[PDB]
Design a protein around this nucleic acid. Sequence first.
RNA 1: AUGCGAAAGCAGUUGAAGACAAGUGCUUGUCGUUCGUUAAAAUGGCCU
Lengths: 159, 50, 104, 99, 56, 99
Amino acid sequence: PKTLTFLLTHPLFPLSRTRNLLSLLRPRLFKQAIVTCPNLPLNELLEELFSIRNRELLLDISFRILQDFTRDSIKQEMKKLSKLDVQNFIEFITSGSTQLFQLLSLVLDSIGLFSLEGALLENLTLYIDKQVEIAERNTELWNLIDTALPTYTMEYLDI
Amino acid sequence: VAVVLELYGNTLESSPVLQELMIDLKTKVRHEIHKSKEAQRIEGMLQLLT
Amino acid sequence: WTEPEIKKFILTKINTDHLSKIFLTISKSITQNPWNEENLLPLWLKWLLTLKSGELNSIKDKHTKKNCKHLKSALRSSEEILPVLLGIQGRLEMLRRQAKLRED
Amino acid sequence: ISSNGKLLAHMCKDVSTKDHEHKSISVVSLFDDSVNLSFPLGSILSSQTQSLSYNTRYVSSMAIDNMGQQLAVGFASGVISIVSLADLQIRLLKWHIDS
Amino acid sequence: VKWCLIIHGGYLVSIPNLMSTLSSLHSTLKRRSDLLPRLLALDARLDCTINKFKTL
Amino acid sequence: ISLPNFNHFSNSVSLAWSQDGSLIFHGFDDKLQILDFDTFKKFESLENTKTVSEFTLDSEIQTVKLINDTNLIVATRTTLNAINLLRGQVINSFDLYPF
RNA sequence: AUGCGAAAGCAGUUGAAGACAAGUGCUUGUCGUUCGUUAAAAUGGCCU
């Protein structure tokens, strides 16, 4: 739809479809929506993030949300999330970047204190510790890329 | 320390007195970076209490 | 090329350029896989840089400096992302200590 | 121009057209025809400023005595060169580092 | 300071004003933590020199 | 204070302040906000009459002022707009992208 | 080194004629000279 891609292209987009267009679009139009849309509801954003459809829309929606939105509000909405897909997401993360790590830190702060199990946390800590090792190695590499006594001599020349 | 290490590497490999000081300086910065690396963990930990 | 003493040896031999093309394969590979787990290829790069950077600086102008800037951007992004890794690592330390206290 | 108003002194490039040494200094009286002097910078310089950078060849300030016997040139490298105009010979005053 | 936050996290969450109650601590940790990368660069160039001269 | 940690950066910001010390117009690029001063958070309404705290305009906002507590005057990179505070609605528009 | 952009950086740029000086018609180098484009050196440092 050229008309709908144009009304995406347009900056201002008042109330109605910007309220509920994800129920209408949920491929290519959705990609144009995720790269550009003025107003998007955080619930819809986070539900897409933890939707396991996973066309690197993870990376894209994570970028969109941590660009436009504020961390305290992100905290309360990830608190209003449901824990089972949170396990799904953290399990997927330790399976297998800036926006992604920002999101992992945020959901850790959102869950807080209580409900984290032994296998999950040991797996997470091994993952992040191996990545800290290789990350610091790469940073030191980055710095690297940023960087009289002939008292007696016996020789000969060619004459 | 960065700019003197930039300049005088020839005299470094020539002279033994400084080779003493550079190895200890290798410890202290590595000692200091471990201190400031632990600093961030305790700062982010306090973010979890908010 | 597996052991680093061998790598210093092969660097002395290859410095006796084809080392520049060695740098080229290393550079393309690094900028195509920055979070690599292996401890040989960045070992190659760090040891090349800390051994014979001078003729690498003075060899050419185009073929090396393009992908030089490429991997430079890559690893600068990594150094941006380091401190939140420290923060997450601190939070995981906190949660491990709390679950341990819940046990004891 | 002199400070009393009687004299004017300037440069020329016709001795570039007529010589290896490019510039020619002239100084002329105004209301009477008392003084009319002309000499090339290729004489007024040393020879030891030949084999150096162009900076010590670039005259950047000019001044004359009121009576008409001293001429001060100021180089682009921080040297004040004064020529007594009788035998047209020099003396150096070295303090500056910029022009 | 590691062990204090392990235990009394309940009452710390209970108070609102974390920042103004822990003003000094927040400042000092900010100090060391954002000092870090200059130390990183210096360590790197130091180790480059170190290997370069004590390999030969 | 109020420090969000946004990883997008506008070179162009502005802000303006009500005369009764209460309404802080924080203009980032393209999306204005009106905040109550006393908590530095968005103006949360119980009335919800489409004078909502967050505004979206066309392009990057250059300068906002309020001439009284009756009109907010906003200038973006292409136009200039004059908006009421009595009601969440634009009033006057002026095209400038020639100049 | 210009354009864009956030303090990241992201792309590109470094080309012509002239005239002269030196070494031996030839090579380099220089420019108080023009076109075309988004383009370190003369021991000489601060008043009372």
